[PDB]
Design a protein around this ligand. Sequence first.
Ligand code: HEM
Ligand code: HEM
Ligand code: HEM
Ligand code: HEM
Ligand code: ARS
Ligand code: ARS
Ligand code: ARS
Ligand code: ZN
Ligand code: ZN
Ligand code: ZN
Ligand code: ZN
Length: 103
Amino acid sequence: XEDMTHVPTDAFGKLERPAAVFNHDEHNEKAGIESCNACHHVWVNGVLAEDEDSVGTPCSDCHALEQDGDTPGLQDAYHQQCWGCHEKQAKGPVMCGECHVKN
Ligand code: HEM
Ligand code: HEM
Ligand code: HEM
Ligand code: HEM
Ligand SMILES: [As]
Ligand SMILES: [As]
Ligand SMILES: [As]
Ligand SMILES: [Zn+2]
Ligand SMILES: [Zn+2]
Ligand SMILES: [Zn+2]
Ligand SMILES: [Zn+2]
């Protein structure tokens, strides 16, 4: 993911909003995220694996557009992960057009 500059959007089909800005490797460095499974997590039978990750598997392989039980749909998964951390840490973009940048 060194060439990533926005979050993948093909799984959404027609977009409402601009692709979310996300230079993956520069973001993770600036945010000080060392564990890949901060995002690329492995949930099995309601248990979060502490020492595994799902690097290489798209979020959309496990997160349909619609919610399934307590597995969030794909929009909700991104918002909870991305906007959820920014709100928890009080750092990074928490307004809609600061992620979904019109440029
Ligand atoms: C989820 C894929 C996700 C997105 C999208 C996202 C975007 C984002 C931007 C565009 C910035 C500003 C520029 C930059 O890349 O530094 C930013 C900044 C921070 N983020 Fe973020 N972010 C996503 C996810 C996450 C997650 C899961 C965390 C916390 C675990 C996280 C944290 C942060 C932090 C901290 C910052 C500030 C960086 C700095 O300038 O200090 N983000 N994010
Ligand atoms: C930990 C250092 C880490 C690794 C390693 C890593 C790898 C990685 C790859 C190989 C991909 C796919 C790139 C491609 O398609 O060419 C990828 C994609 C995404 N990642 Fe990642 N990633 C690591 C860490 C993190 C962290 C900490 C976050 C959350 C802030 C994160 C996020 C994402 C997202 C979003 C994508 C796109 C997923 C998709 O659906 O294709 N990664 N990562
Ligand atoms: C891709 C980086 C990706 C994102 C974004 C994402 C988000 C996400 C959230 C925010 C939740 C809610 C719980 C939590 O905060 O962790 C969640 C829940 C589930 N996930 Fe996920 N997820 C991403 C990637 C993946 C991948 C690649 C898998 C499949 C291997 C996956 C699976 C799941 C499952 C299952 C859940 C539900 C957990 C539970 O409550 O039982 N995620 N995801
Ligand atoms: C502010 C409340 C806000 C809105 C509105 C919004 C909308 C939105 C939609 C409708 C989607 C689905 C795809 C589409 O464009 O149709 C979506 C997807 C993602 N979002 Fe978002 N979003 C708002 C807020 C935020 C913030 C503050 C962030 C960044 C932390 C963010 C990120 C993302 C990501 C990642 C996705 C999936 C990939 C993409 O579509 O770019 N959103 N959002
Ligand atoms: As670097
Ligand atoms: As929120
Ligand atoms: As809250
Ligand atoms: Zn390189
Ligand atoms: Zn851009
Ligand atoms: Zn750098
Ligand atoms: Zn790993």
